[PDB]
Assembly symmetry: D2
Homo-oligomer: 316 residues x 4
């Protein structure tokens, strides 16, 4: 049987009160499908995660990917920032070993609680040869989702996690069924490595909407942001009122990254709504504002060149 | 034939955004003359991502004058897509009329191959001319759909199907004809307690985003710059970082309404007292409304009340 | 507390369709907090094998419970395969404002993370709720309140199996109902149809359109007693060259021809667009998928044989 | 510039359906000259709902000779939307080439307002011309998307977003540029074991629907009239009424393959041995393939094997 480690971090799947040992006891069928062992990396509500928490989780994952005693890794996590952690690990963990991030929308105490099967399915996928080299996976709602572009898109319901580019597969009675492969750079073919990463630069997000001002953009840069993800309307559109503040912030050395709150499909096109070449801005392509923040943080451990940041938004 | 007035505000539907005047928009769709007697007004000429609260008030005031005119049966607003959903919701809350109000944009300018603007405008006029549209609240007619101005949202970039609601389209418009499948359940227009006739100004409301390692910085800065309500665009169920809760409690003590929305915009809603102790903090949940919609309702509402219980009731009924 | 009766019909919700209604209820003790619940076993079937006579029996029992002063709301537990056919049929023929809720599960209560427990809780919560009065028949899976009219089994395996092209009308969360849309189409109290009057349904069958299809399924189904054929066409109810002559002669010999599609996620079949329905005296099924259009074709033909009245019905329900 | 040949077959994309020649389709998109050296051929002029197996063989042999030509870089087929998905999957199985093959149609004719054909055709040529398309299998380029011809389906009537896949678009095409976000996982084109150069005819495969009170009649008449496989378009997970199981045991006993598909088409798939005992019956499940797509794959598989176990492998790899 495969050797799988579960790194627990908290979340509703642990309602964040249960320790990894009771999560494992909760799903006795795990022993039918893998030799499982757990660690408690942290116990948090994922809306409260820090950059310190990600670095600790990422270092611990790498240590396990380097052990020959570990065939696959499952991370139990809060749903609220599951997508951010999943994408982070996709960029920085240079391993073909299966990494599965999994949450639940209900606590194990609720009627029809989703955690038990989610965790069974995360271990099955963590144990499957088909998962090797696929990059980071999320195994909720009987789907295999890419950790790059899966997002918490529906509140309350168990089908919370969607990608604009579709599920890559499904998992049913412990069996993995593939229908698509990834096209963007991940894990083994990533240029980033958590091994070379000691700290993450500060990246914040400001929201675009009618009558918005430059207040959040200025205040976030004054308080440490090295890049601002603009969560614009439409195709990363920027108010004529705020454009001059973004110009001034870029000259001031802040990367201006044009994402959107248009998250079910499509992508932000360079030079369409704003003269990005002229302003030395970047477009976040299809990536939603919290995903763009992660790719921006990870990329700026390696470069501050707006041209290289654009290539990285076009490749990951 | 109904008397339909087209109010032009700009947008890609008038693009080469916001370069063609209403008379060339109308002259580009000669078939309008078959379904209605149309006339045009230029209310403004803007890229809608650049809208001000001043422009919104101006539009709500002009719509109100046309609605009470006996020579007007329906009103079409041509508009940029980027904040179409904000304007549509605003009109839905403040125009106390039964007459059809339709907001319409296009994802492609009229010069582009396979431009969506001509059929969109034809459909908007058809819908605004139709007795079925009366009393339905503000409607949006893109991609052959009749969408509620309340909860339809620009959810897909680039593609002509950009506008979605979590609760589906209410109907379709095909070859000029409206087909209804659902009716609105939330208060609007005729049955709203709000009225543009009594609204001349709007309180400042701003939005801040929730994500990993977020700080209280944006909330504090926005409140220092005049925000009377902060929309929290939370992760998950309006969830709030432990590092941010202290600042939201101070800001509420200071008289700033705290309204928990989310960036989980495909379905579901934010539940009172689930992720945060709203009753304890005297906060409001925004129910199913996305952050930009919650802003529009928050600021229409606070023309009338600062009581957080009334604001919660409004977020549950509108 | 509301008085709610559960009628059990089978389905994976009752899987180990092997569990009696008394076990289903006991397996959700929380039902005691939200209603006074009684169970009856109407039948114990896999819903893929349901018959017209199952439908009438279930409908006639629902009508008797609706007429009773001691019943506030009704829940039917049902297999998911034809849940959408039963829910539409009940929406057409039950003349009552009392809540009727149809419910199944995609996994048996024996499975890890079984969905049947919360589904039944939700069905009783919604059947108990005054908000449900006058709304027509409802389906309460995946935390949603779906219209029985146009909800369909659209996704295999997963618990979000039920979708409507027109979206969920609401949700049910911790036993409370949250409404966002109202039905537009005729249902229940405003229906011209009544299960009280119906003794037996006309025979109605369905044939599929596809490349290189022939007229064979259509003639064989009519030859074995179909009074109406639901064409499950490509595209906008499109009909092959090769099939149009056989459908014209069937119509000529009194078989109703109803143009549906296997294009089910949205849109509708438009009269006179792909085929000259006025000339052929055919009918379009509007938005209704083939199995839905079959239900409505059965109910409609208990009243009329006039193709124009059938088209009016397919435009109103 | 790339050499792209357009094989025209009819459809709404050529409507005044199937009335304009390939020259008029080329002339109505003058910008194609900017992106490729385009040449055409009228293969047939039909409403795609009337297509035959003869039409498919002739089109697959045409596509094969052109792909074999060193003066052709990519191929575009202009087609009716009703059976576009069947043709596309057919070609993705039988055309052993890394050269781009794009099937395209339109939901509105080019005379309608905001007609979708011009941009769809431009995009099909752009993708057919793109080095990124080589090796990807057959593509469909409608609604600014790049869809796999394997599993894209006409899922929405009337609207230009008609074509969807359960597994999402692979990419998008915007201002003639291709943007990829997934790759195919299933066997196609060059790694197919099937080849149009070896196929002179197709076995007869027919489709029958499952629903309440369904009987065995359709299954028996279709087999009596020549079917060698029946595609069972079941409720749920390929479920079969107990009124019908006996009839299908009989037909399989008499050599007719029985392939369990479903009318549950937005997601999941039909699981072997779950709803019916397929090992015991010697039946095949269609996996994620919808009934019309299952038929295509059955027909093509049945030109190389009558072994139900080999057919099931094929349903699992393609
Ligand atoms: N607030 C919780 C929600 C969840 O886990 O579902 C978390 O992310 O930890
Ligand atoms: N930025 C433009 C885009 C559009 O109209 O599609 C606007 O909102 O005006
Ligand atoms: N075949 C079962 C499926 C289910 O109930 O989920 C039935 O319809 O009875
Ligand atoms: N009936 C037409 C429809 C279309 O092309 O959109 C066809 O398939 O030929």
């Amino acid at each position: 049987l495969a050797n799988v480690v579960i790194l627990a971090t908290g979340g509703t799947i642990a309602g964040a009160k249960l320790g990894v040992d009771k999560l494992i006891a909760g799903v006795p069928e795990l022993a039918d499908i893998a030799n499982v062992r757990g660690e408690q990396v942290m116990q948090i509500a994922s809306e409260s995660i820090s950059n310190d928490d990600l670095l600790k989780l990422g270092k611990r994952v790498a240590e396990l990917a380097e052990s020959k005693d570990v065939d696959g890794i499952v991370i139990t996590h809060g749903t609220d920032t599951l997508e951010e952690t999943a994408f982070f690990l996709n960029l920085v963990e240079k391993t073909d070993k299966p990494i599965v991030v999994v949450g639940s929308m209900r606590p194990g105490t609720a009627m029809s609680a989703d955690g038990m099967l989610n965790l069974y399915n995360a271990v099955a996928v963590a144990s499957d040869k088909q998962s090797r080299g696929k990059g980071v996976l999320v195994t909720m709602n009987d789907e295999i989702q890419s950790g790059r572009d899966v997002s918490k898109a529906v509140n309350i319901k168990t089908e919370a996690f969607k990608s604009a580019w579709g599920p890559m597969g499904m998992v049913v009675e412990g069996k993995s069924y593939w229908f698509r492969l990834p096209a963007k750079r991940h894990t083994v073919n990533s240029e980033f490595d958590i091994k070379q990463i000691s700290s993450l630069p500060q990246v914040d997000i400001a929201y675009g909407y009618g009558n918005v001002t430059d207040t959040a953009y200025k205040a976030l840069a004054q308080n440490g942001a090295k890049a601002l993800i603009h969560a614009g309307t439409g195709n990363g559109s920027v108010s004529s009122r705020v454009v001059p503040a973004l110009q001034e912030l870029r000259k001031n050395g802040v990367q201006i990254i044009r994402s959107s709150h248009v998250n079910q499909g499509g992508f932000v096109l360079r030079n369409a709504e704003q003269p990005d070449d002229k302003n030395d801005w970047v477009v976040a392509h299809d990536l939603n504002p919290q995903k763009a923040r992660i790719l921006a943080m990870v990329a700026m451990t390696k470069t501050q060149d707006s041209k290289e940041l654009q290539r990285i938004f076009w490749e990951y």
